[PDB]
């Protein structure tokens with residue numbers, strides 16, 4: 001790595017790890033299109049297993065970027081349209097509040113108040129039907145953004161229905177395999193458990209529990225190498241040979257709604273670059289990021305803007321992840337940690353690194 005990259009990374013990440021008491025961490029900087037890797041600490045504290053470039057971290061809600069791109073690929077294949085009604089893909093969803101709720105609304109958290117989580121009690125498709133049939137919206141569709149695993153989770157499950165594939169099989173065949181993400185998993189194979197870091201919550205080793213729509217909203221595990229490749233693919237989709245996947249990557253960075261200075265993509269969120277760092281840092285705090293916010297539609301959606309800060313946070317009980325990139329600058333960062341530490345500290349560190357390298 002160029003000394004300027006080593007310098008800024010060690011100057012930024014070393015005190016972050018000390019301040020947040022992070023047990024293990026992996027970072028990739030993508031600089032002029034090439035990846036540079038850094039690792040610290042332990043994937044398993046008690047067993048003294050170091051983090052390596054093959055360590056699997058739980059991505060939590062960063063998984064939604066894969067879901068958004070898979071949905072964009074289905075659009076590009078002609079299999080779905082974002083204007084399609086939800087009920088086109090789930091005709092059993094008959095309750096009257098679903099009239100007018102489209103795939104766009106599900107994908108972008110604008111259906112009208114779908115809740116942050118699918119309830120833990122919901123486990124089968126019959127439970128899931130009852131949940132969505134009994135849900136009562138707080139707002140008309142397309143008026144308020146309320147970040148929700150139950151919203152984009154349902155989008156992902158329905159987006160793959162025309163293909164005839166399960167969500168997991170669609171993701172493997174249409175996204176992971178073409179991009180050579182050979183160590184990215186919705187379900188970690190038995191033979192890969194030795195590479196799966198433990199997460200740490202209040203000092204206790206933990207892994208994410210199964211839940212309905214987990215794969216779609218928060219369930220992917222990946223290595224720092226595969227995540228660097230994922231950033232490269234989203235930075236420069238023109239190098240992707242599979243045309244519908246290239247197009248799906250582009251569509252996930254289209255701007256569908258604006259609230260404040262942020263724009264909602266498919267999974268990804270975007271702001272115009274240069275950003276105000278306080279806006280992205282403070283906006284990442286759960287107090288703002290999980291709050292309902294009024295949206296303005298963008299009709300037609302703005303095609304992906306190269307001079308954007310494109311990013312996504314994610315957490316599980318034991319992990320904290322962050323990805324951010326600037327297509328115009330060919331510049332990106334992935335930060336994976338096996339402790340869920342506050343979002344603003346992730347965003348502040350990422351901006352400090354990328355701003356120094358721009």
Ligand SMILES: *C(=O)N1C[C@H](NOS(=O)(=O)O)CC[C@H]1C(N)=O
Pocket residue numbers: 059060061062147149217218284286289312313314315316343
């Ligand atoms: C994703 O990691 N999740 C859903 C939601 N994401 O917001 S975050 O990206 O600002 O963390 C809350 C955290 C997490 C979850 N517990 O489901």
